[PDB]
Structure 1
C-alpha cells in the first residue's frame, strides 16, 4: 500500500485544456571558445556527425547538426576556410582541451 508516498495534484481542470507542441528539445547555446573549438573539430574531421558526437560528450549530436546547418546557412566563408585548413587528428591533446573546457564551464557556473 502507498504509505503517503505521493501527493495529490490539483491539475487537469475538467473545463478544457490547450496544446503545447514543444516538449523536450530545449537546447543550450554555445559560446565563442566553444564555437572556435567546434570549427577546429570540423577542420580536423569533416562533416561526419558520428565522430563529432563521440568526441563531444556534453553536447548532443542533434545540437551539433543544428549548429552545422546554421553555420552552412549563415557563415559560408567560415566553413570554406575550415575545410581549406586541415589538422591531423589529436587524441591526448584533445582530451586535455576537453578537460580545459570542463574547467572553463565550471568557472562560468561559479561566476
Structure 2
C-alpha cells in the first residue's frame, strides 16, 4: 500500500473479440429470429443481452443494409438446429485453423 493510489476508468474491460463466423451466425439469427436480443442472448450463451445490443449498435453503423437483408431472408426457427450449427461451425473453424 502507498499513497500514490492511481485511479482511472476501468469499466472498459477486455471482452472476447467477436468472430467472423459468429457475426455471420448473428445475421442468420436476425434473419431467423429477429431483433429479440434476449432470445438471441439465450441462443448465444457466450454473449449476454447487452453484448447483443452492442453488436446491433456497431453493425448498424455501416452494415444496416446487411441487417435488413438478413431480416428479409427469413427462415424457420429452431433452437436446437441453431445450437448445433453454432458448435459445429466453431469446431470446423478450429479444425481449419
Alignment TM class, shorter chain as reference:
0.7 to 0.9
CA contact under 8 A between 2:37 and 2:53: conserved in structure 1?
yes
Q: Distance in 1 between matches of 2:13 and 2:20?
A: 22
- The C-alpha deviation readout for 1:44-78, integer Å capped at 9, x for no partner, is 11111110001111222221211111111221211
Count of matched residue positions in the alignment of Structure 1 and Structure 2: 97
RCO (CA 8 Å, sep 6+): is it higher in 1 or 2? 2
What TM-score results when the alignment is normalised by the length of structure 2? 0.81
Q: Distance in 1 between matches of 2:86 and 2:67?
A: 22
**CA root-mean-square deviation:** 2.2
Q: Distance in 2 between matches of 1:48 and 1:91?
A: 14
Q: Which runs of 5+ in 2 are unaligned?
A: none
CA contact under 8 A between 1:27 and 1:63: conserved in structure 2?
no
Q: Which runs of 5+ in 1 are unaligned?
A: 1-12
CA contact under 8 A between 2:32 and 2:75: conserved in structure 1?
yes
CA contact under 8 A between 2:25 and 2:86: conserved in structure 1?
no
- The C-alpha deviation readout for 1:86-108, integer Å capped at 9, x for no partner, is 11102332221132145246548
What TM-score results when the alignment is normalised by the length of structure 1? 0.72
* Deviation >3 Å, runs of 4+: 104-108
Q: Distance in 2 between matches of 1:14 and 1:33?
A: 47
CA contact under 8 A between 1:43 and 1:83: conserved in structure 2?
yes
Larger Rg: 1
